Amino acid sequence: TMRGLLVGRMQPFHRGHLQVIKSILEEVDELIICIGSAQLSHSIRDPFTAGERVMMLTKALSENGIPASRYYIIPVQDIECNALWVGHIKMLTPPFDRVYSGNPLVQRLFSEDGYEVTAPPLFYRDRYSGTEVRRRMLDDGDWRSLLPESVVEVIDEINGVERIKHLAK
Amino acid sequence: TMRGLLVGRMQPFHRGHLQVIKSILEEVDELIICIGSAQLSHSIRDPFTAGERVMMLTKALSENGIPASRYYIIPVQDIECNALWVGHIKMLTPPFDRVYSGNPLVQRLFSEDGYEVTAPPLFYYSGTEVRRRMLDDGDWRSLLPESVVEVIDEINGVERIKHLAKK
Amino acid sequence: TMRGLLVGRMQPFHRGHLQVIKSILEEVDELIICIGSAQLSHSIRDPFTAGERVMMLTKALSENGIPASRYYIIPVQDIECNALWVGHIKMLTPPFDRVYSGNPLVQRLFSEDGYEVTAPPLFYRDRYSGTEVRRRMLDDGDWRSLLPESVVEVIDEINGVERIKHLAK
Amino acid sequence: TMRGLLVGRMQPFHRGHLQVIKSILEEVDELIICIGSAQLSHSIRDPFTAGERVMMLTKALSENGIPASRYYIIPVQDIECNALWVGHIKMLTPPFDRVYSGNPLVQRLFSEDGYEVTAPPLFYYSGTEVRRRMLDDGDWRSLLPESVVEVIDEINGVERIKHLAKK
Amino acid sequence: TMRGLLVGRMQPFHRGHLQVIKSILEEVDELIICIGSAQLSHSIRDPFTAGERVMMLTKALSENGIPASRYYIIPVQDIECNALWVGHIKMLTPPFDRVYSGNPLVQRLFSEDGYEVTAPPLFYRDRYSGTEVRRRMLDDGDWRSLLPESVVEVIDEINGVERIKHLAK
Amino acid sequence: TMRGLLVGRMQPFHRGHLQVIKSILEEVDELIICIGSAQLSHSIRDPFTAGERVMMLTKALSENGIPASRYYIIPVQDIECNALWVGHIKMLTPPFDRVYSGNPLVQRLFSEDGYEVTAPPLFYRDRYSGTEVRRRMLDDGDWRSLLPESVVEVIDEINGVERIKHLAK
Ligand SMILES: NC(=O)c1ccc[n+]([C@@H]2O[C@H](COP(=O)([O-])OP(=O)(O)OC[C@H]3O[C@@H](n4cnc5c(N)ncnc54)[C@H](OP(=O)(O)O)[C@@H]3O)[C@@H](O)[C@H]2O)c1
Ligand SMILES: NC(=O)c1ccc[n+]([C@@H]2O[C@H](COP(=O)([O-])OP(=O)(O)OC[C@H]3O[C@@H](n4cnc5c(N)ncnc54)[C@H](OP(=O)(O)O)[C@@H]3O)[C@@H](O)[C@H]2O)c1
Ligand SMILES: NC(=O)c1ccc[n+]([C@@H]2O[C@H](COP(=O)([O-])OP(=O)(O)OC[C@H]3O[C@@H](n4cnc5c(N)ncnc54)[C@H](OP(=O)(O)O)[C@@H]3O)[C@@H](O)[C@H]2O)c1
Ligand SMILES: NC(=O)c1ccc[n+]([C@@H]2O[C@H](COP(=O)([O-])OP(=O)(O)OC[C@H]3O[C@@H](n4cnc5c(N)ncnc54)[C@H](OP(=O)(O)O)[C@@H]3O)[C@@H](O)[C@H]2O)c1
Ligand SMILES: NC(=O)c1ccc[n+]([C@@H]2O[C@H](COP(=O)([O-])OP(=O)(O)OC[C@H]3O[C@@H](n4cnc5c(N)ncnc54)[C@H](OP(=O)(O)O)[C@@H]3O)[C@@H](O)[C@H]2O)c1
Ligand SMILES: NC(=O)c1ccc[n+]([C@@H]2O[C@H](COP(=O)([O-])OP(=O)(O)OC[C@H]3O[C@@H](n4cnc5c(N)ncnc54)[C@H](OP(=O)(O)O)[C@@H]3O)[C@@H](O)[C@H]2O)c1
Known part of the structure; x- marks a missing residue:
C-alpha cells in the first residue's frame, strides 16, 4: 500500500485543490490530506476554522465519488519549530x-x-486560487463557480461571506 | 441537518465502539467522532498515536457499510483548561x-x-481487555474489526506494547 | 509604599482567606492577591474558573469595606517550570x-x-477550609456559613453546587 | 445584573480610556475591563507589562470616584487561535x-x-501620542490621570521607552 | 565519526553517571549527553534547574580530563507527545x-x-544513585562522597542542600 | 568567580563571534554563551537548528584551544513575554x-x-557578519573563509549550503 501526503491551508477548499487531489489519486493507493495552519481563522487571508475546512473537504470528496477508503483528512496546527513539523505531521x-x-x-x-518528495502533478493558475475566491467573496464576484457545490453549501451554512466582509471593515 | 458528537480515546478502536457508533447513526443524520487524548501514545494505557487511531477509524468505518457523508473523524489533543475544551472541540x-x-x-x-447531552444508546469488548490480550498473547483480534487488526499488524502495535511493558 | 503578595487557589474564596487578608492589611499598605492555578476548573478539587474566582474576590473585598486602593486581584496560571514561576507572577x-x-x-x-518571605499572620483550621466547603457542597451540609454572603451569591448565580455534584457522579 | 465588557491594550491607560469607561458605566451595572495583549511588554508600541497596566487601571479607577462594586480588571494574553479567544476571555x-x-x-x-455587541459610546488623547511625547520630552503627563503618572514614575517607564528606542 | 547519545535527569550528576559516560567513550568517538526533564526543578525528586545541571556536567567532565572535542551537553525539556520526543531531541x-x-x-x-539502541555498558547500584544522594542531602549523610568534587562545589555555590531541606518541610 | 553572559542567534557561528568571545574571556573567568532563537531553523535568515549550532560552537571553541573550564554553551528558545525572558535565561x-x-x-x-550590562569589547564589520556568510552560501561566494574550519566541517556534514539554496527557490 502506497500512501501519499498533501498539505495545504485550503482557505477555502476550491476546484483547483480537488483537481490536484484527483491527479494524485492516479499514482497512489491512498492520499493523506492535511489541512495546514489549522489554528488560523477569522482573518481575510485565513477565514475559516479547522472544523469548517474539515467539513468542506469531507463533503467535497464524498460528493465527487472518491471512495472513503482512499483518503484521510487531518487538521494540523503550525508549530514554532520547523525542525519538528515533520514529526508533528x-x-x-x-x-x-x-x-x-x-x-x-x-x-x-x-x-x-x-x-x-515531488511537486504536485498539476499546477492551477491564480484566477482559480484561494486569493481569487476570497477576493470575489469580498467584492460580490462569482466565487461560487470556483468551488464545488458541497463547499458552497458549507460556506452558506457558516455565513462565511458575511464573516469575511465584516473582517474587512 | 442533525449532527451528533462522540468523544473517546479509542486505544484501540474495537467492535464495541463501532456498535455504539452504528446505534448513534439511527438517531442523527451525521456523527462527528473525536479521538480524545490525541497527544498520548507509547504507554500501556495509550499505545497508539493520533495518526494510527485516525487510520483505524477511517478504515473501520469504510470496511463496514457506513457512507462517508455520515461521519467526520477528528483527533483532539487534551488541554490544561477544562473551561476551554468545548471551544477547542x-x-x-x-x-x-x-x-x-x-x-x-x-x-x-x-x-x-x-x-x-445524552448518554450513549448502548453500553458494551473493552480497550483494557484488548490491551491485556495483546500483552498476554490472548485473542485480541476477535475483539476488533479486521481492518483495525490490519492497522495494528502494519504498525507493529503488539511488539510496541510488549516492549513498553518491560522492567 | 509597602506592598505584600499572597497566592492561593481560593476554591472557593471563604471566610478563612478573608481573615488572613485583613490581618495582612494591618502590616502592608497594599496587598496583591493572586488566584493561583487559574487554569484549573471543573473538578472536585478545583471547581471554579479563574473568572468566577475573580468575581468572588472582587465582590467579597468590596462587601467588607476594604478600600479598592489597598488591593489588586490577579489570576495566575500554573506553569511547568518552577524556576520561572516567580518571573511569571x-x-x-x-x-x-x-x-x-x-x-x-x-x-x-x-x-x-x-x-x-513570611508565613501568613493567621492560620485557620481544617473545618473552615476549602476542602470542608466543597465536601459540604457535595453532601448538603452548611457550606454557606463558611463563606461571605457575596461569595454565596456568586455560587448561586453560576450554579456551583449543581456543577460540583454532577462532577462527583 | 447587566454586565458589559471592554478590551484594550492600554499602553498606557490614558484619560480617553477613562472617559469611555465612565460613559459605558451609564449603561451597564458593571463593567469588565480586559487588558489585551497582556504578554507584550518592552517595545515602543507595547512598553508596559500586564502587571504595570493592572496597577494603572486599579489606581485610576480608585482615584476617580468609581465604586469597586462596578468593575473588574483582568489581564488577557493573546492566543494563536482566534476561534478560541472568546472562550479564553x-x-x-x-x-x-x-x-x-x-x-x-x-x-x-x-x-x-x-x-x-456595540461600538463604544464615545470616540476620543491616544496611546500613540502619549508614547511619542514620552520619547520626545513632550507633555505626556497631561494626557494621563495623575495616578497613572505616578505608576509610570515608579516603574521608570520613560527611561525604559527611551532606552528601547536607541539604535 | 561515530556519535552516541545518552539521556538522563541527572538530579544531580554523580560518580555513577560519570563512570557510565567514560565507559561509553571507549565505544564512540563523541557522546551527546542530554539532560532530560530540564523543565523540572525545586522538588525533592528534581531539585536542580537545567542551568545548574549544565554547570555540574560541564565542570565534572572538564575536571576529569575528558577532551571537550568528545562531548556535547544539552538540556532537553520533556514534552507531552511521546511520538514527538525523538524529533525534539x-x-x-x-x-x-x-x-x-x-x-x-x-x-x-x-x-x-x-x-x-543498546543498554549502557555499566549499571551502578542504588547506593550510588541520585535517590541515595538526595536522601543523604536531606538526612545529613555523606552525600559529597557520591559526587565529583566539581559537582559538590556547584551545590555549595547554589545552596542546594538548604534548598532541598526547605522543600522537604 | 566572575561569569559573563553573551547571547546571539549565531546563524552560523563565524570568526567574528569567536573574536568577540576571546576578547570577553580576557575580562571574565567564565563565559556563558547562549544560542538565541533556538526554535528557528530552515529559513534564509535562520538556516540551522539549535543542535547544529551547538555542534558549531562546541567544535569551534575546542579547535581554538579555549579550555572547557571557561565556557558553557546553551540553546535558548525565544518566548512571547519579554518580561520573562531573563528568568528563562x-x-x-x-x-x-x-x-x-x-x-x-x-x-x-x-x-x-x-x-x-556592557557592550561587547569588539564590534566586527558587516562584511564578516552572518548576513554576508549566508549571502555567500547562496551566491557561491567564499563563505568558508568567514568561518573557523571546524564550522565549515559541520556545514559540509549537514549539507547546509544545499539546504539554504533549496529554501531560496
Ligand atoms: N513549522 C510549521 O508549522 C510549518 C512548516 C512548513 C509548512 N507549514 C504549513 O504547511 C502548510 C502548507 O504550506 P504551503 O506553503 O503550501 O502553504 P499554503 O497556504 O498551502 O500555500 C501554498 C500557496 O500555493 C498555492 N498552491 C498550492 N498548491 C498549488 C497548485 N497545485 N497549483 C497552484 N497553486 C498551488 C496555494 O494557493 P491557494 O490559495 O489556492 O490554496 C497558496 O497560494 C501551511 O499551512 C504552512 O503554514 C507549517
Ligand atoms: N480538558 C481536556 O482536555 C478534556 C476535558 C474532558 C475530556 N477530555 C478528553 O475527552 C476524552 C473523553 O473522555 P472519556 O472518559 O469518555 O473517554 P475515555 O478515555 O475513552 O474513557 C471512557 C471509558 O469508558 C469506556 N466507554 C466509553 N463509551 C462507552 C460505552 N458506550 N459503553 C461502555 N464503555 C464505554 C471506555 O472504554 P474503552 O477503553 O474500551 O474505549 C473508557 O474505559 C478523553 O480523552 C479525555 O482526556 C479532555
Ligand atoms: N510552577 C508553578 O506554576 C507553581 C509553583 C508554586 C506554586 N504554584 C501555585 O501557587 C498557588 C498557591 O500554592 P499553595 O501550595 O498555597 O496552594 P493552595 O491551593 O493555595 O494550597 C495551600 C493549602 O493550604 C491552605 N491554606 C492556605 N493558607 C492558609 C492559612 N492561612 N491557614 C490555613 N490553611 C491555609 C489551603 O487551604 P484552602 O483549601 O482553604 O484554600 C490549601 O489547603 C497554587 O495555585 C499553586 O499551584 C504554582
Ligand atoms: N486571538 C487573540 O488573541 C485576539 C483576538 C482578537 C483581539 N485580541 C486582542 O484584543 C485586544 C483588542 O483589540 P483592539 O484593536 O480593540 O485593541 P487595541 O490594541 O487597544 O487597538 C484599538 C485601537 O483603537 C483605539 N481605541 C480603542 N477604543 C477607542 C475609542 N473608544 N475611541 C478611539 N480610539 C479607540 C486604541 O487607542 P489607544 O492606543 O490610545 O488605546 C488603539 O489604537 C488586542 O490586545 C488584541 O491583541 C486578541
Ligand atoms: N515525552 C517525553 O518528554 C519523554 C519521553 C521519554 C523520556 N523522557 C525523558 O528522558 C529522560 C531519561 O529517561 P529515564 O527513564 O532514563 O529517566 P532518568 O530519571 O534519567 O533515569 C531513570 C532511572 O534510572 C537510573 N539509571 C540511569 N542510568 C543508569 C545506569 N547506567 N545504572 C543504574 N541506574 C541508572 C537513574 O538513576 P539516577 O537517579 O542515579 O539518575 C534513575 O533512577 C527523562 O528526563 C525523561 O523524562 C521524556
Ligand atoms: N522575548 C524573547 O524571547 C527575547 C528577548 C530579547 C532577545 N531575544 C533573543 O536574544 C538573541 C540575541 O538578541 P540580538 O538582538 O543580539 O540578536 P542577534 O541576531 O543574535 O544579533 C543582532 C545582530 O547584531 C550582530 N552582532 C552581534 N554581536 C555583534 C558584534 N559584536 N559586532 C557586530 N555585530 C554584532 C549580529 O550579527 P551576526 O549576523 O553576524 O550574528 C546580528 O546581525 C536573539 O536570539 C533574540 O531573538 C529574545
Whole structure:
C-alpha cells in the first residue's frame, strides 16, 4: 500500500485543490490530506476554522465519488519549530511514503527526514486560487463557480461571506 | 441537518465502539467522532498515536457499510483548561447539535455551553481487555474489526506494547 | 509604599482567606492577591474558573469595606517550570516587597529571587477550609456559613453546587 | 445584573480610556475591563507589562470616584487561535451580557458566540501620542490621570521607552 | 565519526553517571549527553534547574580530563507527545548514530525512528544513585562522597542542600 | 568567580563571534554563551537548528584551544513575554554576573533585573557578519573563509549550503 501526503491551508477548499487531489489519486493507493495552519481563522487571508475546512473537504470528496477508503483528512496546527513539523505531521497521520508539495520549505523538511518528495502533478493558475475566491467573496464576484457545490453549501451554512466582509471593515 | 458528537480515546478502536457508533447513526443524520487524548501514545494505557487511531477509524468505518457523508473523524489533543475544551472541540469540528457521552465532566462542560447531552444508546469488548490480550498473547483480534487488526499488524502495535511493558 | 503578595487557589474564596487578608492589611499598605492555578476548573478539587474566582474576590473585598486602593486581584496560571514561576507572577503584578505564604516551595522560590518571605499572620483550621466547603457542597451540609454572603451569591448565580455534584457522579 | 465588557491594550491607560469607561458605566451595572495583549511588554508600541497596566487601571479607577462594586480588571494574553479567544476571555472573566468594541475582529468573534455587541459610546488623547511625547520630552503627563503618572514614575517607564528606542 | 547519545535527569550528576559516560567513550568517538526533564526543578525528586545541571556536567567532565572535542551537553525539556520526543531531541543535538538507554520507552521511541539502541555498558547500584544522594542531602549523610568534587562545589555555590531541606518541610 | 553572559542567534557561528568571545574571556573567568532563537531553523535568515549550532560552537571553541573550564554553551528558545525572558535565561544557565550585549532590548531587560550590562569589547564589520556568510552560501561566494574550519566541517556534514539554496527557490 502506497500512501501519499498533501498539505495545504485550503482557505477555502476550491476546484483547483480537488483537481490536484484527483491527479494524485492516479499514482497512489491512498492520499493523506492535511489541512495546514489549522489554528488560523477569522482573518481575510485565513477565514475559516479547522472544523469548517474539515467539513468542506469531507463533503467535497464524498460528493465527487472518491471512495472513503482512499483518503484521510487531518487538521494540523503550525508549530514554532520547523525542525519538528515533520514529526508533528507523522504523529497525526497514518504512515506514508511520498509527499507532494511545491513549497521549498515543505520539500526540504520532508527530504531531510528521508521521504520521497515531488511537486504536485498539476499546477492551477491564480484566477482559480484561494486569493481569487476570497477576493470575489469580498467584492460580490462569482466565487461560487470556483468551488464545488458541497463547499458552497458549507460556506452558506457558516455565513462565511458575511464573516469575511465584516473582517474587512 | 442533525449532527451528533462522540468523544473517546479509542486505544484501540474495537467492535464495541463501532456498535455504539452504528446505534448513534439511527438517531442523527451525521456523527462527528473525536479521538480524545490525541497527544498520548507509547504507554500501556495509550499505545497508539493520533495518526494510527485516525487510520483505524477511517478504515473501520469504510470496511463496514457506513457512507462517508455520515461521519467526520477528528483527533483532539487534551488541554490544561477544562473551561476551554468545548471551544477547542468546536474549533476543530463541524457545527453540531447533540453530544453523546457517559462521562460526567464531558457532560457538564457541554451542558454549560448550551448543548443537548445524552448518554450513549448502548453500553458494551473493552480497550483494557484488548490491551491485556495483546500483552498476554490472548485473542485480541476477535475483539476488533479486521481492518483495525490490519492497522495494528502494519504498525507493529503488539511488539510496541510488549516492549513498553518491560522492567 | 509597602506592598505584600499572597497566592492561593481560593476554591472557593471563604471566610478563612478573608481573615488572613485583613490581618495582612494591618502590616502592608497594599496587598496583591493572586488566584493561583487559574487554569484549573471543573473538578472536585478545583471547581471554579479563574473568572468566577475573580468575581468572588472582587465582590467579597468590596462587601467588607476594604478600600479598592489597598488591593489588586490577579489570576495566575500554573506553569511547568518552577524556576520561572516567580518571573511569571512579577510580570502579571505591580511591584511588591514581601510575600506571605506557608508553602515551602512558594517560600523558597521567592526567597531565591531576593524577596522577603513570611508565613501568613493567621492560620485557620481544617473545618473552615476549602476542602470542608466543597465536601459540604457535595453532601448538603452548611457550606454557606463558611463563606461571605457575596461569595454565596456568586455560587448561586453560576450554579456551583449543581456543577460540583454532577462532577462527583 | 447587566454586565458589559471592554478590551484594550492600554499602553498606557490614558484619560480617553477613562472617559469611555465612565460613559459605558451609564449603561451597564458593571463593567469588565480586559487588558489585551497582556504578554507584550518592552517595545515602543507595547512598553508596559500586564502587571504595570493592572496597577494603572486599579489606581485610576480608585482615584476617580468609581465604586469597586462596578468593575473588574483582568489581564488577557493573546492566543494563536482566534476561534478560541472568546472562550479564553470567558474563562477569565465574570459572566457578561454585552461587548463594547469598535474592532471588527473582536465584534465578529463575540457576535458569532451569541453576544450582543456595540461600538463604544464615545470616540476620543491616544496611546500613540502619549508614547511619542514620552520619547520626545513632550507633555505626556497631561494626557494621563495623575495616578497613572505616578505608576509610570515608579516603574521608570520613560527611561525604559527611551532606552528601547536607541539604535 | 561515530556519535552516541545518552539521556538522563541527572538530579544531580554523580560518580555513577560519570563512570557510565567514560565507559561509553571507549565505544564512540563523541557522546551527546542530554539532560532530560530540564523543565523540572525545586522538588525533592528534581531539585536542580537545567542551568545548574549544565554547570555540574560541564565542570565534572572538564575536571576529569575528558577532551571537550568528545562531548556535547544539552538540556532537553520533556514534552507531552511521546511520538514527538525523538524529533525534539534531534532538533537540539548534533547528528548521532546510537542511543544508550536502559529505559524501555526511550529504547522503543528511538528504535521506531530507525536508530540503533543498546543498554549502557555499566549499571551502578542504588547506593550510588541520585535517590541515595538526595536522601543523604536531606538526612545529613555523606552525600559529597557520591559526587565529583566539581559537582559538590556547584551545590555549595547554589545552596542546594538548604534548598532541598526547605522543600522537604 | 566572575561569569559573563553573551547571547546571539549565531546563524552560523563565524570568526567574528569567536573574536568577540576571546576578547570577553580576557575580562571574565567564565563565559556563558547562549544560542538565541533556538526554535528557528530552515529559513534564509535562520538556516540551522539549535543542535547544529551547538555542534558549531562546541567544535569551534575546542579547535581554538579555549579550555572547557571557561565556557558553557546553551540553546535558548525565544518566548512571547519579554518580561520573562531573563528568568528563562537564568533557569537554563549557571549563575552569572555581567551581560555583554549591544542590543537595547537585551540590555534593558537585564538591567531591569539588576544585572550589570556592557557592550561587547569588539564590534566586527558587516562584511564578516552572518548576513554576508549566508549571502555567500547562496551566491557561491567564499563563505568558508568567514568561518573557523571546524564550522565549515559541520556545514559540509549537514549539507547546509544545499539546504539554504533549496529554501531560496
Ligand atoms: N513549522 C510549521 O508549522 C510549518 C512548516 C512548513 C509548512 N507549514 C504549513 O504547511 C502548510 C502548507 O504550506 P504551503 O506553503 O503550501 O502553504 P499554503 O497556504 O498551502 O500555500 C501554498 C500557496 O500555493 C498555492 N498552491 C498550492 N498548491 C498549488 C497548485 N497545485 N497549483 C497552484 N497553486 C498551488 C496555494 O494557493 P491557494 O490559495 O489556492 O490554496 C497558496 O497560494 C501551511 O499551512 C504552512 O503554514 C507549517
Ligand atoms: N480538558 C481536556 O482536555 C478534556 C476535558 C474532558 C475530556 N477530555 C478528553 O475527552 C476524552 C473523553 O473522555 P472519556 O472518559 O469518555 O473517554 P475515555 O478515555 O475513552 O474513557 C471512557 C471509558 O469508558 C469506556 N466507554 C466509553 N463509551 C462507552 C460505552 N458506550 N459503553 C461502555 N464503555 C464505554 C471506555 O472504554 P474503552 O477503553 O474500551 O474505549 C473508557 O474505559 C478523553 O480523552 C479525555 O482526556 C479532555
Ligand atoms: N510552577 C508553578 O506554576 C507553581 C509553583 C508554586 C506554586 N504554584 C501555585 O501557587 C498557588 C498557591 O500554592 P499553595 O501550595 O498555597 O496552594 P493552595 O491551593 O493555595 O494550597 C495551600 C493549602 O493550604 C491552605 N491554606 C492556605 N493558607 C492558609 C492559612 N492561612 N491557614 C490555613 N490553611 C491555609 C489551603 O487551604 P484552602 O483549601 O482553604 O484554600 C490549601 O489547603 C497554587 O495555585 C499553586 O499551584 C504554582
Ligand atoms: N486571538 C487573540 O488573541 C485576539 C483576538 C482578537 C483581539 N485580541 C486582542 O484584543 C485586544 C483588542 O483589540 P483592539 O484593536 O480593540 O485593541 P487595541 O490594541 O487597544 O487597538 C484599538 C485601537 O483603537 C483605539 N481605541 C480603542 N477604543 C477607542 C475609542 N473608544 N475611541 C478611539 N480610539 C479607540 C486604541 O487607542 P489607544 O492606543 O490610545 O488605546 C488603539 O489604537 C488586542 O490586545 C488584541 O491583541 C486578541
Ligand atoms: N515525552 C517525553 O518528554 C519523554 C519521553 C521519554 C523520556 N523522557 C525523558 O528522558 C529522560 C531519561 O529517561 P529515564 O527513564 O532514563 O529517566 P532518568 O530519571 O534519567 O533515569 C531513570 C532511572 O534510572 C537510573 N539509571 C540511569 N542510568 C543508569 C545506569 N547506567 N545504572 C543504574 N541506574 C541508572 C537513574 O538513576 P539516577 O537517579 O542515579 O539518575 C534513575 O533512577 C527523562 O528526563 C525523561 O523524562 C521524556
Ligand atoms: N522575548 C524573547 O524571547 C527575547 C528577548 C530579547 C532577545 N531575544 C533573543 O536574544 C538573541 C540575541 O538578541 P540580538 O538582538 O543580539 O540578536 P542577534 O541576531 O543574535 O544579533 C543582532 C545582530 O547584531 C550582530 N552582532 C552581534 N554581536 C555583534 C558584534 N559584536 N559586532 C557586530 N555585530 C554584532 C549580529 O550579527 P551576526 O549576523 O553576524 O550574528 C546580528 O546581525 C536573539 O536570539 C533574540 O531573538 C529574545
